[PDB]
Paper text:
These ring–shaped proteins topologically encircle DNA providing a sliding platform for the majority of DNA polymerases and many DNA-interacting proteins. Most typically these partners bind to the processivity factor via a conserved motif (β-clamp: QL[S/D]LF and PCNA: Qxx[I/L/M]xxF[F/Y]) at their extreme N- or C-terminus, although internal motifs are not unknown. Pol V is a heterotrimer consisting of the catalytic UmuC subunit and a homodimer of UmuD’ and was originally identified as being central to damage-induced mutagenesis.
The structure of the E. coli β-clamp was solved in complex with a fluorophore-labelled synthetic UmuC β-binding peptide to 2.5 Å resolution. The asymmetric unit contains a single β-clamp dimer with a peptide bound to each monomer. The 12-mer peptide consisted of Dylight649-C-QGVAQLNLFDD363, with a cysteine included to permit linkage of the fluorophore to the peptide. The OE1 group forms a hydrogen bond with a conserved solvent molecule, with the NE2 group forming two hydrogen bonds with the main chain carbonyls of Met-362 and Pro-363 on the clamp. The density for peptide Asn-359 is well-defined, due to a hydrogen bond formed between its OD1 group and the NH2 group of Arg-152 on the clamp surface. Peptide Leu-360 is located within the hydrophobic pocket on the clamp surface defined by residues Val-247, Leu-177, Val-360, Pro-242, Met-362, with the main chain nitrogen forming a hydrogen bond with the carbonyl group of Gly-174. Remarkably, and in contrast to the other peptide-clamp complexes, peptide Phe-361 does not penetrate the hydrophobic pocket of the clamp and is solvent exposed. The principle interaction appears to be hydrophobic in nature, with the hydrophobic portion of the clamp Arg-246 side chain. We suggest that greater reliance is placed upon the UmuC Asn-359 to clamp Arg-152 interaction, since no intimate interaction exists between UmuC Phe-361 and the clamp, with Phe-361 involvement limited instead to interaction with the hydrophobic portion of the side chain of clamp Arg-246.
Numbering used by the authors:
A (entry chain C): 357 to 361
B (entry chain D): 356 to 361
C (entry chain B): 0 to 21, 24 to 364
D (entry chain A): 0 to 21, 27 to 208, 212 to 364
Amino acid sequence: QLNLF
Amino acid sequence: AQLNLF
Amino acid sequence: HMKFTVEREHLLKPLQQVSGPLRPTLPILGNLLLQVADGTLSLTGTDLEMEMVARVALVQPHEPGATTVPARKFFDICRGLPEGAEIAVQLEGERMLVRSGRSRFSLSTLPAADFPNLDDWQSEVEFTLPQATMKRLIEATQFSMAHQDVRYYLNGMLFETEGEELRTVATDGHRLAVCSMPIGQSLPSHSVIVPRKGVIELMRMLDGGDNPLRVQIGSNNIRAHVGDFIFTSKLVDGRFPDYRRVLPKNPDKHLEAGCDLLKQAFARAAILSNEKFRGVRLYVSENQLKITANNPEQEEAEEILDVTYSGAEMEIGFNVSYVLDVLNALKCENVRMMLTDSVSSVQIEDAASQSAAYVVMPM
Amino acid sequence: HMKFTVEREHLLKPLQQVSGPLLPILGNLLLQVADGTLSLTGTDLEMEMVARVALVQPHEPGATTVPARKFFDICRGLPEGAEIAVQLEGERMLVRSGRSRFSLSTLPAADFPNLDDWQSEVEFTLPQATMKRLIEATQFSMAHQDVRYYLNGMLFETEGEELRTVATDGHRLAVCSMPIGQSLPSHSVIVPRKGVIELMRMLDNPLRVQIGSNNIRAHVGDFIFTSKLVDGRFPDYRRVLPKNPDKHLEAGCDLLKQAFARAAILSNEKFRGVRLYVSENQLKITANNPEQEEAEEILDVTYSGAEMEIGFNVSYVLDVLNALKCENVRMMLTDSVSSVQIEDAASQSAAYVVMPM
């Protein structure tokens, strides 16, 4: 699950 | 505080 | 290989009932055994101590066989499907394929031969009774069971058949509840202890309608049938205490009061009692009850109630939770307190009915 | 010294509200009789909740603090309609009703924690329903106990004639804006997670909001809530919103929710990944787990873009859909490595951005 930005 | 029966 | 096609509403209530004993430990125990035989699907759930079997008549084409599937996933699937869904089950590989509309699910299986099997046993006592009676007997005493006492035998409920009565007893050593109810049949003398989990599952099988409860009790087992559902449990080993012998030998002092007024008095006083020990103090006098409570904070509460009492005066202390428990169970209008002295237990009863007695030991 | 006599039902809802935020003093409520009014205050040092009860019976001014939960339980345990008589007397408060008598310990009112004076820089009123909608629409996207403290809260943004709320935990985001009738200055603060929960429960029609540089206050009927703001700089929502989605899918909110709820059952318990195949007028949702189990749901939808696969944390999707209590939903896609924007098809009030797996 990836972080934004 | 609180006794057992018998 | 096993195949059946059934409406969702045929499976909901049964899947729910048999999922009862189901934290996760030994994968097979998280599975339900599925069996198509003789125009019938059987669903079995187990914890090794107890098992519950449900039968569903199959009115559509089916094929015999058996497998096991995860209980909760299989239930959540059928519960998740829309109202009126057709649920078609088949096997291929070591999986079970469930299909409804354009919803398709593939569950892992474990062999049916591996599924744990409660050994065969013999019934020695048999009777029927209404579900409402089994409910009353459990509701009236369940709360007095010991929690996780090393006396395994107190972590259960006594079921006693005597004459034409079925009776339940429960105690943790400090307090006790006994309830007896008639069931219209002449019975032999027998006593067994059903474990905590057994009382839960059994109270939970009571759908609260018309089907009567068929009980069978053996040397180390008990079984209840209702509808097309069948619960079976191991019994707890050991010897339960005799209730005849805990009941105050002859109380001389009888007090009557409103169940609600007395409950709310004690519930209020309880707020300012010791969080640990929960002691409240009772001072009975002609037609009056004073309940007081105090705590390490030097806070105190005091409640005075009008009651019917004409015996001698006395003070007596109680764990207020034990009292509240009893009063919560006695869903009635007036209560009867039966006192002896400040160092002896009290018997509490509904003033209108001697079906259930409660004995609580003083502090 | 302090004395008042009041009906139980006058005290229940206020005692309950001010106990919400809950050292020993912090377990106490400040009680203040003044100007024909009782004030009840509860605090956790970060925020405080004040309730006012008009006193129509003889009273005497003064103040003390009492244990919140014991005082509430006493008044709640009292019978319907009881007259509760309170009075301070040295180190104890006395509460009396019928033949029920209680003696509570006190802590001095001078000791009770004060939130320091501050100045309002922004003021507006709005209906309670709008404050609810704004919080309900985005609350669930707040990070729980992230070390990025600035995410364990909710952004409140005033811009033009709109009040806007933003919430994100780094993986997903929710933004809601609603029109409020007065031109407002540009101002952007973070209310802490707790304050958001408290302010949400006081809605239960105009709310008056005041916002300073390190404080927010909400007046609602006879209640005044105040909170510290979270320090730091919240992410810009303008910048998380997919740059220009080319692919628009429409489907029934409930049918989509339920397809996903069913697929979710056989997804990884840890990661909760489901896969979406979009094709002309069709959505295939799939899930599989380490058990080799799998679920497959096919739905009719309105879609005519290109085909694509994309994976999602199904819980993030279910959260969004649960919050969008509507009939049809709008999924706005770009590609398999980019976030999706989800919205109610009939309303652009609230947008949701969820990052792929």
